[PDB]
Structures are given as C-alpha cells and as structure tokens.
C-alpha cells in the first residue's frame, strides 16, 4: 500500500505542476518573463467514503387500509387503526477517492511596486485561472515584493 | 484505482483544453492575435450515485373493498373498514459518473483600455460560447488589463 | 513490517525534500543565492482508521402504522400504538494511511537586517508556497539572522 | 524477534542521523564550520496498539415504536413503552508501530560568547528545523560554551 501512497504523492505533485503551468500561461504575457514568481500547494484527500441514505416523506402519507369504529351511548368510544404508505428514496453514493480538499496559491510580483488596482485585477484573473473556491478553504495571496 | 484517478485528471484537462479552443475560436477574430489571454478551470465530480424512488399519490385513492356497518337504537355505532389502491411510481436512476460540478473562466483583454459596453458584449458572447451556468456555481470574469 | 516503517521514513523525507525544493523555487529569485537558509520538518501519521457511522433523523419521523383507542364515560382511557420510519444514513469511511499531521517550516534570511514589512511579505508568499495550515498545528518561522 | 529489536535500534539511529544532517544543513551557513556542535536523541515507541471504539449519541434518540396507555377515573394510570434508535459510530484504529515518543536536541555554540537575542534566534530556526513539539515532551537546549 505504500506504493499506492507514493503514487498519491505523485498525483498531488502533478496537479500542482499543471496549476503552475496554467498560472504561467496567464501571467507570462501579462507581466513578462522573470517579473513574477508563483508556487501552488494542493492537498488531496484519499478517503473511501461510501454512503447509503434511506429517506422518507412524513408530510404526504397515503392510507392503504383503514378501520374506524365510533360508537356512542354518555359513553363515546373511538377506535381506529390505520396503515400508511410513504415516499421512499434510497440513494447509494460512492465518492471519488482523491479530491482536492484545499488549494493554496501565492504569487509575488517584482517591483519596478504595483498599484492596488492592478493587483486586484491580477487576483481577479487568477480567480478563474486556478478555479478559486473560498468555500473549500482555498487561499490566494498576491503580493508585490522586491526581487534581488 | 489510482490509474483511474489519473485518467480522471486527463478527462478534466481535456475538457479545459476544449473550452480554451472554443474561447480562442470566438475571440481570435473579434479581438485579434495576442490581444487577449484566457484560462479555464473545470472541476468534475466522479461520484457513483444510484437512487431508487418509490412515490405514491395520497390525494387520489381508489377503494378496492369496503365494509360499513351503521346501526342505531340513543346508541349510534358506526363501524367501517376500507382498503385502498394508490398510484405507485417506482423510478430507478443512475447518474453519470463524471459531471462538471463547477466551471471557472477568466479572460483578460490587452489595453490600448476597453469600454464597459464592449466588455459586457464580450461577456455576452462568452455566455453561450462556454455555456455559462450560474445556478451550477460557474464564474466568468472579463477584465481589461495592461499587457507588458 | 520494519521494512514498511523504513519506507514510511522514506516517504516523510521525500515530502520534506519536495517542500524544500518549492521553497527554493520561490526564494531563489526573490532573495538570491546563498542569502537564505530553510529547513522543513514533516510529521506524517500512518494509522489505519476505518469508521462506520449510522445516523438517524429524530425530528422527521413518518408514521407507518397507527392504532388509537379513545373511550370516555368520568373515565377517560387513551390507548395508542405507533410505528415509525426514520431517515437512515449509513456511511463507511476508510481514511488514507499516511497523512501530514503537522508541518514545521523555518526560514532564516541573511542580514545586510530586513524590515518587518518585507519579512511579513515573505511570510505571506510562503503561506501558499507551502500550504500553511494553522488549524492542523503547522508552524512557520521567518527570521533575519547574521550569516557567518 | 531480537533481530527485529536490532533493526528497531537501526531505525532510531537513522532518524537521529537524519536530524543531525538537517541541523548541519541549517547551522553550517549561519555559524560556520567547527563553530558549533550538536547531538540528537530520539526515543521511539514500537508498541502494537489496536483500538475499537463504539460510540453512541444519547441526546438525539429517534423513536422507532411507541405505546402509551393513559386512563383516568381519582385513579390515574400512565403506562408507556418506547423503543429508540441511536446514532452509532464504530471506528477501528490501528496505530503505526514505531512513533517518535520523545525527541531531545542539544546545540553548543563556540564562544568568541553569543548574545541572548542571537541564541533565541537560533532556537527559533531550530524550532521548525527539527520539528520541535513541546506537547510530546521534546526538549531543545541551545548553549554558548567555550571550545578547547
């Protein structure tokens, strides 16, 4: 199984490399060659979830058989027996093993600095270039630093 | 199964490449060569959902057999027994494995900037060029940036 | 099994080496050659967790059969029998063996010192370069020291 | 099995050697060649823990069947029978055999002494260079001594 773990590491590294390639394909025309640096971290879960759900519909029952005895005298006896049929959904789901659980991307732009408007524009391009998903916990940093 | 995961990555990359090709086929005449850059992120779910639904119709029962005893004296006894037949739908669905769960497209247009009207027109063309589906969670960014 | 433990050590060392390579790929342009030193510690758990969860939904029961006797005279007898159907989820999860439980990264920058703003900018780049995850217990130190 | 114990000793020594190599890779640029000495002690547990946990959820029961008799006359009789369904988690964990239970690192720096600020900076670099974990019981000593 350790060979499987090794190949999982290979998958994660391949994903990171592909994302880096896309980042380059976007930023190389916009910024130029050597005016930026970017690295990508991709964390992938490899669990084996397998779920079975059996759901009913309480608010729409359908009476199948029914008995109702109601006699008076004073005495009032109200017996009743009822059988129901209910909407039944049975869903069996099997999640894919390797899923990107969190994605971290950081891009540093060489100074000569960059204005806030262009930094936010680059961030907007990257959002969509990488597939930024904040609800997944992903993080995207864009900074303007001084290259040596 | 890790080979299957590798081929799933290949499928996702192929989808992204096809969408990029369509984006180019639309924008190359409109904008020109080298006046734009665009990248596409496609996230695909590969679950194995398999659902079985059994639904009834509570509001239209059909009486199959019926017994009704109603005697008086004062004393009033009202016995009743009833059997019903109901509309029964049984649907077994099996979803396709790989489905595009979210799609992100970002396009950056070289300045010399672009007016808001033409930006929105390009966005309208892309909506339909790519098959934008906001209800799916898809995202489409169109920006006017300064190429270096 | 000790061979398996040896290969687990190899996996941990490989992960550390990959993270060091990424750190170099980010900092070598920004800082230069020989102006920094960085080391990475990665602790990986290799447990064999395997969980089975059976969850219900108490607040949405669906009555399947029902009996209700209610007679008066004074005397008031209220008998009742009820059978329910409940939403039932059965999920079997099998965690991946080797998972990064804690990650420690330390970077030391050669003086001639570095201002706090640039130190924090480098820290921001590293956050995303390495995939910093404070909730996991990870730690990232960036210091400005005097190289001999 | 004594051969297994011998190989466990080999594993511990290999871990110590790797940590020493990392310590050198960090301190050799910062301090220089022959200006420091450091040794590492790693204690590793090799137990064979294997745990099975069966946990319930007392505060969210779901009633499956129910009987309730409540008659009056004075006399008040309240009989009741109830069956419940509970959330059931069954997790089987199998810990990895060899785990670092305690780690001790000591570093001695040649005088001409070292200021407290630089000693603490070196300590901060080592924390992260080695993966210092105080909650595990690890210990890290950094001293400035006079080499002969």
């Amino acid at each position: 199984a350790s060979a499987a773990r090794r190949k999982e590491q290979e998958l994660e590294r391949s994903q990171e490399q592909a994302l880096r390639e896309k980042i380059d394909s976007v930023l190389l025309p916009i910024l130029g060659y050597g005016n930026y640096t970017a690295q990508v971290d991709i964390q992938m879960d490899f669990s084996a979830v397998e779920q079975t759900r059996k759901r009913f519909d309480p608010n729409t029952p359908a009476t199948r058989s029914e008995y109702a005895l109601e006699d008076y005298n004073g005495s009032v006896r109200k017996e009743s027996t009822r059988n129901f049929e209910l909407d039944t959904t049975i869903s069996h789901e099997r999640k894919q093993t390797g899923t990107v659980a969190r994605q971290t991307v950081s891009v540093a732009i060489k100074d000569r600095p960059m204005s806030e408007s262009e930094i936010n524009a680059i961030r907007q391009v990257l959002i969509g270039t990488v597939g930024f998903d904040q609800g997944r916990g992903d993080l995207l940093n864009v900074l303007s630093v001084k290259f040596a | 199964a890790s080979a299957a995961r590798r081929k799933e990555q290949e499928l996702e990359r192929s989808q992204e490449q096809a969408l990029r090709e369509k984006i180019d086929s639309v924008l190359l005449p409109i904008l020109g060569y080298g006046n734009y850059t665009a990248q596409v992120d496609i996230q695909m779910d590969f679950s194995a959902v398999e659902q079985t639904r059994k639904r009834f119709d509570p509001n239209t029962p059909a009486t199959r057999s019926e017994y009704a005893l109603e005697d008086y004296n004062g004393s009033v006894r009202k016995e009743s027994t009833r059997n019903f037949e109901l509309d029964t739908t049984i649907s077994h669905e099996r979803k396709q494995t790989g489905t595009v769960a979210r799609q992100t497209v970002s396009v950056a247009i070289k300045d010399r900037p672009m007016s808001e009207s033409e930006i929105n027109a390009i966005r309208q063309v892309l909506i339909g060029t790519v098959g934008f589906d906001q209800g799916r969670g898809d995202l489409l960014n169109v920006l006017s940036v300064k190429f270096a | 099994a000790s061979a398996a433990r040896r290969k687990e050590q190899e996996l941990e060392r490989s992960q550390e080496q990959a993270l060091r390579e990424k750190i170099d790929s980010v900092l070598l342009p920004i800082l230069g050659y020989g102006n920094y030193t960085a080391q990475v510690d990665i602790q990986m758990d290799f447990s064999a967790v395997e969980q089975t969860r059976k969850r219900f939904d108490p607040n949405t029961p669906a009555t399947r059969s029902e009996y209700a006797l209610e007679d008066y005279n004074g005397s008031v007898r209220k008998e009742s029998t009820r059978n329910f159907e409940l939403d039932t989820t059965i999920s079997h999860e099998r965690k991946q063996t080797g998972t990064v439980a804690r990650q420690t990264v330390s970077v030391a920058i050669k003086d001639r010192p570095m201002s706090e703003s640039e130190i924090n900018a480098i820290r921001q780049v590293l956050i995303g370069t390495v995939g910093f995850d404070q909730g996991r217990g990870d730690l990232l130190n960036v210091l400005s020291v005097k190289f001999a | 099995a004594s051969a297994a114990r011998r190989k466990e000793q080999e594993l511990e020594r290999s871990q110590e050697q790797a940590l020493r190599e990392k310590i050198d890779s960090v301190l050799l640029p910062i301090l220089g060649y022959g200006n420091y000495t450091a040794q590492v002690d790693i204690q590793m547990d090799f137990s064979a823990v294997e745990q099975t946990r069966k946990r319930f959820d007392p505060n969210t029961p779901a009633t499956r069947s129910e009987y309730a008799l409540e008659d009056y006359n004075g006399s008040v009789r309240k009989e009741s029978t109830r069956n419940f369904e509970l959330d059931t988690t069954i997790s089987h964990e199998r810990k990895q055999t060899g785990t670092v239970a305690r780690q001790t690192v000591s570093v001695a720096i040649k005088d001409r002494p070292m200021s407290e600020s630089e000693i603490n900076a070196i300590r901060q670099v080592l924390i992260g260079t080695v993966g210092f974990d105080q909650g595990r019981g690890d210990l890290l000593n950094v001293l400035s001594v006079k080499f002969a």
Binding site: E50, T52, K54, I90, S91, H92 | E50, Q51, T52, K54, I90, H92 | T52, K54, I90, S91, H92 | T88, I90
Partner: peptide, 17 residues
C-alpha cells in the same frame, strides 16, 4: 463490519428496485 454489510445489502436493494 455488520453495519457496513447492511449498507451494502441496502445498496443491492436499491439496484434491484
């Protein structure tokens, strides 16, 4: 274990339906 086997049997019931 037993619960996982019950889940598999429920999935088989789904497939049969």
């Amino acid at each position: 274990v037993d619960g996982i086997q019950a889940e598999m049997r429920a999935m088989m019931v789904e497939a049969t339906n």
